[PDB]
Amino acid sequence: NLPEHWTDMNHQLFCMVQLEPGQSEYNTIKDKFTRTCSSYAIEKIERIQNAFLWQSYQVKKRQMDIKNDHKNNERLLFHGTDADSVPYVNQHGFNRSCANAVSYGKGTYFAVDASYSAKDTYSKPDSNGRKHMYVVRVLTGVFTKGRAGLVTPPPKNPHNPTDLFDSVTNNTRSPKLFVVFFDNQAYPEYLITFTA
Amino acid sequence: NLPEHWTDMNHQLFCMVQLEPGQSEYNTIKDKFTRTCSSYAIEKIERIQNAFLWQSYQVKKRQMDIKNDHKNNERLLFHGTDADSVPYVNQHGFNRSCAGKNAVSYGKGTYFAVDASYSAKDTYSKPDSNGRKHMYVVRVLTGVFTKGRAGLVTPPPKNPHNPTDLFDSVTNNTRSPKLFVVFFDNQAYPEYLITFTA
Numbered sequence: 001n002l003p004e005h006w007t008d009m010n011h012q013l014f015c016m017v018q019l020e021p022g023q024s025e026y027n028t029i030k031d032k033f034t035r036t037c038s039s040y041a042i043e044k045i046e047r048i049q050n051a052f053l054w055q056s057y058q059v060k061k062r063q064m065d066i067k068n069d070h071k072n073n074e075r076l077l078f079h080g081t082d083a084d085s086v087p088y089v090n091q092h093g094f095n096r097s098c099a100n101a102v103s104y105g106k107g108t109y110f111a112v113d114a115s116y117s118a119k120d121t122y123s124k125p126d127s128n129g130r131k132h133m134y135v136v137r138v139l140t141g142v143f144t145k146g147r148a149g150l151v152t153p154p155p156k157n158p159h160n161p162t163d164l165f166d167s168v169t170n171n172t173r174s175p176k177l178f179v180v181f182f183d184n185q186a187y188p189e190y191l192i193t194f195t196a
Numbered sequence: 197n198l199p200e201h202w203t204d205m206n207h208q209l210f211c212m213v214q215l216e217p218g219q220s221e222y223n224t225i226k227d228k229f230t231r232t233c234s235s236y237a238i239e240k241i242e243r244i245q246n247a248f249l250w251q252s253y254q255v256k257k258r259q260m261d262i263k264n265d266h267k268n269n270e271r272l273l274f275h276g277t278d279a280d281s282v283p284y285v286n287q288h289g290f291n292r293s294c295a296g297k298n299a300v301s302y303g304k305g306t307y308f309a310v311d312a313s314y315s316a317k318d319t320y321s322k323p324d325s326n327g328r329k330h331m332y333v334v335r336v337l338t339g340v341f342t343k344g345r346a347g348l349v350t351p352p353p354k355n356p357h358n359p360t361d362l363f364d365s366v367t368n369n370t371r372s373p374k375l376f377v378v379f380f381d382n383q384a385y386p387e388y389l390i391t392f393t394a
């Protein structure tokens with residue numbers, strides 16, 4: 001059940017597809033980034049077509065939509081990383097056992113604003129000054145305020161300890177960071193290669 | 197597609213089902229256990245019916261069967277744990293971020309034993325206040341494996357010049373495996389909980 005906007009993969013299960021400048025998909029992803037990163041230079045945008053990562057993610061989404069009894073569990077977020085992590089993320093997605101600060105818990109971190117992910121500490125410039133940021137589908141679901149040392153989100157009710165929040169944030173009224181603690185709660189959808 | 201021999205869960209997503217001694221389902225688990233744990237005695241064997249854990253595990257199995265082009269990817273292994281961990285594992289499965297440092301570490305992941313005897317040690321299946329010890333019987337996607345190393349947070353690559361093409365699991369010994377370590381969520385399904393005593 002692979003998304004309609006994907007391009008044919010000749011019966012392959014993994015392809016990085018460079019987007020054409022000026023077309024709608026490219027323009028939509030460009031604007032999300034330039035909203036807060038209009039001072040940077042975009043070299044290219046790639047659609048991540050990972051069928052295995054996509055089905056594992058869609059299964060979790062269907063599970064969360066049922067458990068939460070609504071379908072507002074998904075957000076579009078940013079993740080800056082180093083050149084050496086890119087092949088891993090394209091192929092295997094986000095892994096909390098890899099991850100800088102972890103002051104809201106030991107999970108994978110996603111930014112509301114591209115400009116947060118554009119910091120050199122996250123989108124580390126390679127030899128050439130090239131920086132890498134993903135546009136990520138993440139199942140934030142029902143979230144609470146994080147804190148240092150969490151290995152999973154907290155329970156909603158301390159009297160049902162196993163019924164958990166889906167994600168954690170820096171601030172529930174006005175979130176700028178989300179962290180998720182489970183594989184396949186995030187799908188890396190686009191890779192933006194850019195420079196200062 | 198939940199399996200057809202499961203109890204009807206009446207639209208519910210989770211159920212522990214107590215097995216009856218003399219059923220093949222109970223007896224096979226008891227033989228697997230007593231093969232190395234003759235000195236212990238089983239209080240009960242519960243079938244774990246977790247719809248969500250089953251779905252995610254089954255999509256990972258189908259993915260690994262496609263990728264490895266063979267279907268010898270799944271082993272039935274043991275996992276001893278403490279009583280405080282049992283409600284979390286029943287609902288959420290095995291979380292490498294919660295895993296103990298093993299006495300012989302072949303990587304930072306969730307450990308599964310070939311022999312019940314290994315999982316039966318008090319270090320893993322810690323007796324609760326009532327002398328009850330807890331051991332899961334677990335479907336594990338061991339897939340293609342290699343000898344692990346203490347430093348691993350992911351399985352190593354099959355080929356150093358292709359760092360993203362990973363072994364599926366690691367073992368203590370590839371010729372005679374007694375334990376397996378997995379590094380991903382939904383790579384292990386807790387199928388039975390054995391409650392036992394001395």
Ligand SMILES: COc1ccc(OC)c2c1sc1nncn12
Nearest residue numbers: 078079080100101109111117122
């Ligand atoms: C405190 O926030 C983070 C901690 C760690 C992060 O990745 C190592 C991270 C953020 S925000 C962000 N955007 N891309 C990556 N990350």
